[PDB]
């Protein structure tokens, strides 16, 4: 059904590097150059206070819509990924439901500034205190710490491309019907990522990558915090939360 569902040659692995990097380039929601330029554009003490004074439900809704928009670009990235559209729909949905949020969490390090511990949010950079109204300080600080640790790796756009391809194509996701097909596609993407690192003398980052349990913890923490919020404001979830967000998380 696809060349990457079988053993690929070196030349075919080189093509895969280029294909993933291209799919990533085209599905970037935010340009790296725009993100770095915006670093000096920081929310004022008054803007911070204004976000903090927003009701818990209002803040949750704004964050849910922004997450949804990020997810939309990840679905497009998946569709453009070699072999993804050749998997069955059950498997595509299994991969996106378990991995979309994980991809968004990795992509986030680009919009995060390790210098002053700020993140790009609604046009400006702000510290974690910006999200205080959400009432999930442990999750937010765990998200800022993850972005901080990925920032210290100084990933290129091509490294993010390949590492995110691998975050999504995980043959271990519960519910995959064509597991062996996912295993071969995963093997080839692993080879494409490790090949690119070898060629660019960047293999030293492999031991530095976060353990898989780290992305899972962040994802389980998001699911848990959403359950607490849903109990408090069930009609907010039902009436004002985006349908794609709910399909993925509830």
């Amino acid at each position: 059904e696809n060349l990457y569902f079988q053993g690929a040659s070196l030349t075919e692995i080189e093509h895969l590097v280029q294909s993933v990097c291209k799919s990533y380039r085209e599905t970037c929601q935010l340009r790296l150059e725009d993100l770095l330029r915006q670093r000096s554009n920081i929310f004022s003490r008054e803007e911070v206070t204004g976000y903090q004074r927003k009701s818990m439900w209002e803040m949750w809704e704004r964050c849910a819509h922004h997450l949804t928009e990020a997810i939309q670009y990840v679905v497009e990235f998946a569709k453009r990924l070699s072999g993804f559209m050749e998997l069955c729909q059950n498997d595509q949905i299994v991969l996106l439901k378990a991995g979309a949020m994980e991809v968004v969490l990795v992509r986030m390090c680009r919009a995060y500034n390790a210098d002053n511990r700020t993140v790009f949010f609604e046009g400006k950079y702000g510290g974690m205190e910006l999200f205080r109204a959400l009432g999930c300080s442990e999750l937010i600080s765990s998200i800022f710490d993850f972005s901080h640790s990925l920032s210290a790796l100084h990933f290129s756009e091509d490294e993010i491309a390949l590492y995110t391809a691998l975050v999504l194509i995980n043959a271990h996701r519960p519910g995959l019907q064509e597991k062996r097909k996912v295993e071969q596609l995963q093997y080839n993407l692993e080879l494409a990522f490790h090949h690119h690192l070898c060629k660019t003398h960047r293999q030293s980052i492999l031991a530095k990558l976060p353990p898989k349990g780290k992305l899972r913890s962040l994802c389980s923490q998001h699911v848990e915090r959403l359950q607490i919020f849903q109990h408090l404001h069930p009609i907010v979830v039902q009436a004002a939360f985006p349908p794609l967000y709910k399909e993925l998380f509830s």
Partner: peptide, 10 residues
């Protein structure tokens, strides 16, 4: 519903 729609829309 949405995920299905996004995957099928080319």
């Amino acid at each position: 519903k949405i995920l299905h729609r996004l995957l099928q829309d080319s």
